[PDB]
Amino acid sequence: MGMSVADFYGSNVEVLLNNDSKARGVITNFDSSNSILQLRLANDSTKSIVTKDIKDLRILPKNEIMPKNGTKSPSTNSTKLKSAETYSSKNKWSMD
Amino acid sequence: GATTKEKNISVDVDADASSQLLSLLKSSTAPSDLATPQPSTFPQPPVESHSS
């Protein structure tokens, strides 16, 4: 039907600017009066860009954006920091 | 059975929606802004609801 940008706040998308340069990041804000868009990129960096310099916009795929794979990946299986005294391999239950 | 593409899934992400975001920044677009003038109404309620 039709939605406003407030629904797409926090969306990760890529944007090509009038100078044929590309930049992608997760949106944080947009001001109607000045049309000014803040993007918070996953490298812990903030960047404010005024939308008027946008030549074109596109939404990127969710996860696996840089790396290319052909698996469903139902679980993230991540263990960054926070370690316990238990180890798990493949799956806790097999042939169950 | 077997299909041409190994991946099918369902999800929701049409390539045409990306154009709507760039279309909004470029112009209002609205329901009509190109064909000849015609009798139409554009109500704008203060609050929108999906269920009632």
UniProtKB/Swiss-Prot annotation, chain A:
Domain Sm: 3-63
Domain of life from the UniProt record: Eukaryota
Localization (cell): Cytoplasm, P-body
Record's signal peptide: none
Function: Stimulates decapping of both stable and unstable mRNA during mRNA decay. Stimulates decapping presumably by preventing the DCP1-DCP2 decapping complex from adopting an inactive conformation. Together with pdc1, acts as a scaffolding protein sufficient for the phase transition of the components of the 5' to 3' mRNA degradation machinery to form P-bodies. Intermolecular interactions between the edc3 Sm domain and at least 10 helical leucine-rich motifs in dcp2 and pdc1 build the core of the interaction network of this spontaneous clustering process.
Subunit structure: Homodimer. Interacts with dcp2.
Homology family: Belongs to the EDC3 family.
Protein name: Enhancer of mRNA-decapping protein 3
Organism from which the protein derives: Schizosaccharomyces pombe (strain 972 / ATCC 24843) (Fission yeast)
Organism taxonomic ancestry: Eukaryota, Fungi, Dikarya, Ascomycota, Taphrinomycotina
From Swiss-Prot, chain B:
Domain of life according to the entry: Eukaryota
Bias type Polar residues, positions: 29-39
Compartments, as annotated in UniProt: Cytoplasm, P-body
Region (Disordered): 29-50
Family: Belongs to the Nudix hydrolase family. DCP2 subfamily.
Oligomeric and partner information: Component of the decapping complex composed of dcp1 and dcp2. Interacts with edc3. Interacts with pdc1; via N-terminus. Interacts with pdc2.
Job description of the protein: Catalytic component of the decapping complex necessary for the degradation of mRNAs, both in normal mRNA turnover and in nonsense-mediated mRNA decay. Removes the 7-methyl guanine cap structure from mRNA molecules, yielding a 5'-phosphorylated mRNA fragment and 7m-GDP. Decapping is the major pathway of mRNA degradation in yeast. It occurs through deadenylation, decapping and subsequent 5' to 3' exonucleolytic decay of the transcript body.
Name of the protein described by the UniProt record: mRNA decapping complex subunit 2
UniProt lineage: Eukaryota, Fungi, Dikarya, Ascomycota, Taphrinomycotina
Gene of this entry: dcp2
Residues of the full protein shown: 242 to 291 of 741
